[PDB]
Every structure is written in C-alpha cells, then in structure tokens.
Design a protein around this motif. Structure first.
Motif, short mmCIF file in Angstrom:
data_model
loop_
_atom_site.label_atom_id
_atom_site.label_comp_id
_atom_site.label_asym_id
_atom_site.label_seq_id
_atom_site.Cartn_x
_atom_site.Cartn_y
_atom_site.Cartn_z
N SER C 3 0.81 -1.23 0.00
CA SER C 3 0.00 0.00 0.00
C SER C 3 0.84 1.27 0.00
O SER C 3 1.69 1.46 0.86
CB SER C 3 -1.06 0.02 1.13
OG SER C 3 -0.65 -0.75 2.24
N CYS C 4 0.57 2.13 -0.98
CA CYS C 4 1.30 3.38 -1.16
C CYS C 4 0.35 4.54 -1.30
O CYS C 4 -0.83 4.34 -1.63
CB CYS C 4 2.14 3.30 -2.41
SG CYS C 4 3.41 2.07 -2.21
N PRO C 5 0.84 5.75 -1.03
CA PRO C 5 -0.04 6.91 -1.21
C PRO C 5 -0.34 7.13 -2.71
O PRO C 5 0.28 6.49 -3.55
CB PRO C 5 0.77 8.07 -0.60
CG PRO C 5 1.80 7.42 0.23
CD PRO C 5 2.12 6.10 -0.40
N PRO C 6 -1.31 7.99 -3.03
CA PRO C 6 -1.55 8.37 -4.44
C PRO C 6 -0.29 8.81 -5.20
O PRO C 6 0.56 9.46 -4.63
CB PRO C 6 -2.51 9.54 -4.30
CG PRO C 6 -3.32 9.18 -3.06
CD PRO C 6 -2.42 8.38 -2.15
N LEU C 7 -0.17 8.42 -6.47
CA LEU C 7 0.98 8.79 -7.35
C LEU C 7 2.23 7.96 -7.13
O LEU C 7 3.16 8.03 -7.93
CB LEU C 7 1.33 10.29 -7.30
CG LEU C 7 0.18 11.26 -7.67
CD1 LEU C 7 0.46 12.74 -7.42
CD2 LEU C 7 -0.45 10.99 -9.05
N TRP C 8 2.25 7.20 -6.03
CA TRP C 8 3.39 6.38 -5.65
C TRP C 8 3.02 4.97 -5.98
O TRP C 8 1.83 4.64 -6.03
CB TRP C 8 3.70 6.47 -4.15
CG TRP C 8 4.26 7.79 -3.73
CD1 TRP C 8 3.58 8.95 -3.52
CD2 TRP C 8 5.64 8.09 -3.50
NE1 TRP C 8 4.44 9.96 -3.15
CE2 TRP C 8 5.72 9.47 -3.13
CE3 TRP C 8 6.82 7.33 -3.52
CZ2 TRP C 8 6.92 10.10 -2.81
CZ3 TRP C 8 8.03 7.97 -3.22
CH2 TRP C 8 8.07 9.33 -2.86
N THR C 9 4.02 4.14 -6.22
CA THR C 9 3.77 2.79 -6.71
C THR C 9 4.64 1.83 -5.91
O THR C 9 5.81 2.13 -5.64
CB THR C 9 3.99 2.68 -8.25
OG1 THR C 9 3.61 1.39 -8.69
CG2 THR C 9 5.42 2.89 -8.65
N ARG C 17 8.61 6.54 -6.56
CA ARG C 17 8.08 7.54 -7.46
C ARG C 17 9.21 8.16 -8.26
O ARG C 17 10.28 8.49 -7.71
CB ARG C 17 7.29 8.60 -6.71
CG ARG C 17 6.55 9.55 -7.67
CD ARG C 17 5.60 10.47 -6.92
NE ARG C 17 5.19 11.60 -7.75
CZ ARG C 17 4.63 12.73 -7.28
NH1 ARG C 17 4.42 12.89 -5.97
NH2 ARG C 17 4.29 13.70 -8.12
N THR D 2 -4.19 2.46 -0.27
CA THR D 2 -4.71 1.44 -1.15
C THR D 2 -3.55 0.60 -1.66
O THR D 2 -2.50 1.14 -1.98
CB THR D 2 -5.39 2.10 -2.35
OG1 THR D 2 -6.36 3.07 -1.90
CG2 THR D 2 -6.06 1.05 -3.24
N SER D 3 -3.73 -0.71 -1.73
CA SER D 3 -2.67 -1.57 -2.26
C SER D 3 -2.92 -1.92 -3.70
O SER D 3 -3.97 -2.42 -4.05
CB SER D 3 -2.49 -2.83 -1.42
OG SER D 3 -3.66 -3.17 -0.72
N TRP D 8 1.12 0.48 -10.88
CA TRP D 8 -0.22 0.99 -10.72
C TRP D 8 -0.26 1.84 -9.49
O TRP D 8 0.56 1.68 -8.60
CB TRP D 8 -1.22 -0.14 -10.56
CG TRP D 8 -1.45 -0.93 -11.79
CD1 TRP D 8 -0.64 -1.92 -12.30
CD2 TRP D 8 -2.56 -0.84 -12.69
NE1 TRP D 8 -1.18 -2.43 -13.45
CE2 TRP D 8 -2.36 -1.79 -13.71
CE3 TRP D 8 -3.73 -0.05 -12.71
CZ2 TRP D 8 -3.27 -1.96 -14.76
CZ3 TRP D 8 -4.62 -0.22 -13.77
CH2 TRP D 8 -4.39 -1.18 -14.77
N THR D 9 -1.21 2.76 -9.42
CA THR D 9 -1.24 3.70 -8.30
C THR D 9 -2.64 3.84 -7.76
O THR D 9 -3.58 3.95 -8.50
CB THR D 9 -0.63 5.08 -8.67
OG1 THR D 9 -0.51 5.90 -7.48
CG2 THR D 9 -1.45 5.78 -9.73
N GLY D 10 -2.76 3.79 -6.45
CA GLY D 10 -4.06 3.68 -5.80
C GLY D 10 -4.64 4.99 -5.33
O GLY D 10 -3.91 5.91 -5.00
#
Ligand SMILES: OC[C@H]1O[C@H](OC[C@H]2O[C@H](O)[C@H](O)[C@@H](O)[C@@H]2O)[C@H](O)[C@@H](O)[C@H]1O
Ligand SMILES: OC[C@H]1O[C@H](OC[C@H]2O[C@H](O)[C@H](O)[C@@H](O)[C@@H]2O)[C@H](O)[C@@H](O)[C@H]1O
Ligand SMILES: OC[C@H]1O[C@H](OC[C@H]2O[C@H](O)[C@H](O)[C@@H](O)[C@@H]2O)[C@H](O)[C@@H](O)[C@H]1O
Ligand SMILES: OC[C@H]1O[C@H](OC[C@H]2O[C@H](O)[C@H](O)[C@@H](O)[C@@H]2O)[C@H](O)[C@@H](O)[C@H]1O
Ligand code: CA
Ligand code: CA
Ligand code: CA
Ligand code: CA
Lengths: 156, 156, 156, 156
Positions: C3-9, C17, D2-3, D8-10
């Motif tokens: 699980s990563c924050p938005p925009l991060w993978t 990122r 989010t995972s 891909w990005t959550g």
C-alpha cells in the motif's frame, strides 16, 4: 502484510476469523457464505467458506490462532476441535475443500481420516495432535474458521 | 483497509491484539514494548504500547474485540476487565496514555475514575459497563490489548 | 501487494516515485527528504531518500518503471539516466546508499564504476545498458527516483 | 492507503494506470480488459476498464496524475486529452461508464458534451480546461487511463 477488515486477521493474502458459537458442518459453511466479495457497482462476485490450507506455514498460522484464542480450552487430548473446509467422501482418497481449491497439502494426524465415508476435517488443537487434522461427524457442533473470498489480480 | 501482521487486527490505520495471559499494568506495558517499528536498514524507530482510544468508534471496535474473543467470561458485572494504556495520576484530571497521545475522548463509566491516585484504566466488558472504562489498581493481573506503533506518511 | 499513497507505486513493501524535473545529486536527495514518516501523535520518525535496490527483482521493477514512464526518451546509448541513492567514495569498494541500507546487490554495468572518486549511481535505461547502473558526476542534472521510508513491524 | 500491483497507483480503494500509446476508444477499453480479477482457484471474476470518476477528489487525483506524467505536453488549450470510460449516447442525458457504475458526478467542462450522439469522454489537461472533461470522436487516437476491477468485501 495482508489487508483485512476489522476483526479479521491476514496471512499470505488471505483473511481469516475464528467464530466461537458451535455449529455443525453445513451450518458452519453456511455461516461463512454470509461473507462476500462484490464489485463496487453492486454485483456479488464470490462467497466465503470454511478455511482451506495449502502449506505447512498456513497450518502453523491457523494452529497458533486457535491456541492463542482458546488458551483455557486446550486439553491433553484432541480438544478443542475446530471446523475447516475439508470433506472426505466415499473413500479416503476423495478429499475436497468447500472453496473448491486443490488438496495439495496433507495436514492429517497419522491414522486420519478413519471415520469415512462422508466425514469432515477439523483442526485438533489438544496436546495430542498439536493442531493437525482429525476427521469427525458432520453433526458435531464445533467452533469454526472462515476465510474471505481469496482473490488476486491477473496482468496480461 | 488497514494492513496488519498475522494475528493482529486493524482498525482505522492502527493494529491491535488481545493477549490472554494476566499481567499487572507495568508488566503488560512491557510486553507491548517488545513489539516495534524499524527502518529496513536496521534502526529501531518506535515501540508498542497498551492500546489508546480516540473516538467512540475505536471504543466500539475494542469492545467488540473483547466480547467476541472472551464470550464465556462475560459477566453481569464489570468482568472481564482488560488493560488499556490509561494512567490516572495525582488528581482525576491528570490523565495520560502510555504511547503519549492526547486524551481527547472520555470513555469512562460514570463515577470513574474513583480509585486514584495512580490508578489504571481497563475496558470493563461485563453487562454493567458494556466495555466502557473502569479504573483499578496497577497490581491487578489482567489480560490486555497492545497496539503497534501508530504511524503515517507526511507529504510535502 | 503493497500500500502506497496516491501517485506512488509499490513493490515488495516499498513505495517509489519517479520525478521528471532535473536536479543534481544533492538537490535530488534533498527533494526525497521532504517526504517522511510520522507518529500519529506528531513526532517525525524518518525521512525519504533516493531509491536503493537490493535484488534483481527490485532492479527489473525500477527499470520497467523508467522505461514505461519515459518511452520517447529511450536511446540506443545510455540515456535516459536517472538518479538512485548510490555513492562511490574514495575507492570503488567504498559504496553506500543514502537511506543507510547495505550494498548486497551489484547492479553495475560491467566496467562501472569508473569515474571515481566521489561519483554517483544512476539507472541507465538506454538500449546499451538496459537500466543497469552507470556512475556519473554529482553535478549532472537528471530525473530521479524517491523511496518512502521503508519500515516493518517487529515481533518478538 | 490502497494496495495496488507494481506500476499501478491507488486512490480511495481503486488502482489506476496511465498508458502512453495512442488508441481509439474501443481499442483502449479493450486494452484495459486485458487486466482482470480471479479467484485463487482459477475462475476469472471480473475485467478491467477505462477509469470512471465518482467525486471531485477522484477527479483532482486523476488530473494530477496526467499533469505529473506528461508535463511537457500541457498546452494552453485542451491538449493533452486522455480517454476515460465515459459514453454519451443518443442524447446528452444518456451517459454511461464502461465498468457500469453510476454517473453521480458531473465533471464536464461547461458547454460539454456537444459532439453527440455517440461521442466519448476524455480528461482535457490543457490550461483551458484544467483536467475537466471534453467529449470527442471515438475514432481519435489518445492515451488513456485503466482501472482494475473495483471490489470490496461484504460483511453481511
Ligand atoms: O476427533 C477426535 C478423535 O475422535 C475419536 O477419538 C478417539 C479418542 O477419543 C476417546 O474418547 C478417548 O478418550 C481417546 O483416548 C481417543 O484417542 C476418533 O477415534 C479419532 O479418530 C479422532 O477423530
Ligand atoms: O474495577 C471494577 C470496579 O470496581 C469497583 O466496583 C464497584 C462495583 O462492585 C461492587 O462489588 C458491586 O457489586 C457493583 O455493583 C459496583 O458497581 C469500583 O467501585 C469501580 O469504580 C470499578 O473500579
Ligand atoms: O553515464 C554514462 C556513461 O558515460 C561515459 O560514456 C561512455 C559511453 O559514451 C561514449 O560517448 C560512447 O559513445 C559510448 O559508446 C560509451 O560507452 C562513461 O565512460 C561511462 O562509464 C558511463 O558513465
Ligand atoms: O476536444 C476538445 C474540444 O474540441 C473543440 O474545441 C473548441 C476549442 O478549440 C478551438 O480550435 C479553439 O482554438 C479553442 O479556443 C476552443 O475552445 C470543441 O468545440 C469542444 O467542445 C471540445 O470537444
Ligand atoms: Ca477420526
Ligand atoms: Ca474504579
Ligand atoms: Ca561511469
Ligand atoms: Ca466536445
């Protein structure tokens, strides 16, 4: 780390929970089927199930979950026995899981199964069996472990 | 969803666990400090702690966790009582959490705390108190709830 | 699954990122240090960092991330080069990561590093080097990859 | 948090990805349908899809994803335009998403849709429209955003 809803606990991409009320095998499997997976737009995609177990690591995790949750019930025999999704059919080689996954791990206590035909698997957490599986009558009322629909993304 | 290690259960970005052996308050807090957070490069960054509670929702979740885990011990009184990280000091207004967070939610049963100075908070899950808090002697031996180091990313 | 924050993978418990503005090594590392980890009660526990890489699998993932994000920049040479946290000091054997983790994977293109002392690592995604590492001058302005503070729970 | 899978990005329990090759609307949706969801025992449960958007927060996130990924393409007009799963049918009021979720958020630039019937939605990231939606010909070749099957557990 696996993500699971509150009260549920994850291992290896699966979410589990032990329930404390005593049900027979069919009622227990039915109880687990009340938990589901759904698209965000409404369609129900899958249902829960009594737990299936596919490795010595899954087995050790489930054993510890039973032992930590029920510490005052642990006897020097088999008890406490707790339902998992295992079905023995007309012969001992007919083994299936309620979630329909494959039987690729033998977790039976030696001697088991021996109450066929149409017996049911249970984790036997007493000191005699150390969590490994006994087969029993479907009409026994036991605690049980549910799994949530197991799922993964496919990329291709 | 919250992601927690096996045997632990997540709610609202925190991971909790109920331990079934009875410890006094200091030994319990000690047991929770055996769980930590670390950089992947090896430095230990934080320690665990008896649980803190910051909302009626956290409180209802912890209550349900105790009731579902200990269904046969529920009395019509206060018992079972289970440790959380609450410290009442020299006066009732001196309230602190062991993880150092703020006391911004009052979960006390009315009339509590009333055993100061230097008493300790517990979830009182019997039918009389419904999980809301009693204060007690630090020398009582109870089951207890640990939280793993609570932590979030900062993005600027 | 991570699980990563938005925009991060995510890959393998870490969140990455790629940033498109060009910065020299120090400014880039500095840019990644603006991202952090913090207790819910306020204390800043760790900082971000240019990416480190500890396996052939981390390496292939970072390579793919560069190639899929900058498809029109891929040349038949070394370009595009993108900063990671590798430091070569006074000799070729003095190799460190900015996050302080261990250098236990050799991702260098054969012949590299060769611009010591005090050179810097970069992913070389042109067709000649296939994403494997070149060493360069700290004063080159490049795009770069940040990682969020890598962390795990400790249980014992 | 989010995972999502690598690359891909959550956001908000959904996984997204921007693809850099230009496809018409049908080919684009088809490309997203190559990504699926499956039971661990083998049955395909759902398919991917051009992104749908259900709140101003989803919309700002997708806008930022386009702007950060394509920084040199941002014009002072509508360009770059990027496909999402929006279909305008025989009238402007016939609006559907390819994943079949509900149209409960209006993200159109004022004046849009105006190229019906049977036009398609796109995020228009140029300075004129700021990411908000234009409607276009299905036969335009654009970059696009896929979403993985959106799903949640049902605790019923
Ligand atoms: O499911 C547990 C177990 O049930 C049967 O138990 C045999 C055991 O229980 C007896 O009452 C006796 O007290 C024990 O000494 C004895 O081992 C069954 O025979 C086993 O196969 C197993 O299923
Ligand atoms: O820790 C629990 C509780 O202990 C004390 O209990 C008062 C209660 O117990 C009596 O024996 C009686 O049976 C109950 O009806 C009565 O509520 C203390 O007084 C409480 O503050 C609390 O600590
Ligand atoms: O940073 C990339 C690279 O820089 C230097 O380049 C050597 C390469 O570039 C030459 O212009 C020639 O065209 C190429 O064939 C040659 O491989 C340096 O020598 C490398 O160590 C590396 O740093
Ligand atoms: O797809 C984007 C957009 O296409 C049409 O564009 C109108 C805009 O483009 C003109 O060439 C002019 O340069 C701009 O000032 C003007 O805003 C269409 O009219 C829009 O509905 C929209 O589809
Ligand atoms: Ca038997
Ligand atoms: Ca009291
Ligand atoms: Ca070099
Ligand atoms: Ca239009």
């Amino acid at each position: 780390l696996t993500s699971c809803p509150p009260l549920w606990t994850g291992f290896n991409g699966k979410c589990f929970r032990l329930f404390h009320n005593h049900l027979n095998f069919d009622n227990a499997e039915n109880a687990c089927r009340q938990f589901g997976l759904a698209s965000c737009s409404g369609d129900e995609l899958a249902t829960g199930h009594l737990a299936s177990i596919h490795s010595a690591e899954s087995q050790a995790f489930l054993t510890e979950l039973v032992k930590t949750s029920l510490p005052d019930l642990i006897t020097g025999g088999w008890a406490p026995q707790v339902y998992i999704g295992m079905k023995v059919g007309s012969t001992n080689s007919d083994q299936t899981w309620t979630d329909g996954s494959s039987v690729d791990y033998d977790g039976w206590v030696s001697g088991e199964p021996n109450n066929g035909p149409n017996s049911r698997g249970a984790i036997a957490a007493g000191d005699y069996s150390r969590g490994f599986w006994a087969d029993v009558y479907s009409n026994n009322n036991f605690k049980y472990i549910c799994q949530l629909p197991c799922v993964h993304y496919t990329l291709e």
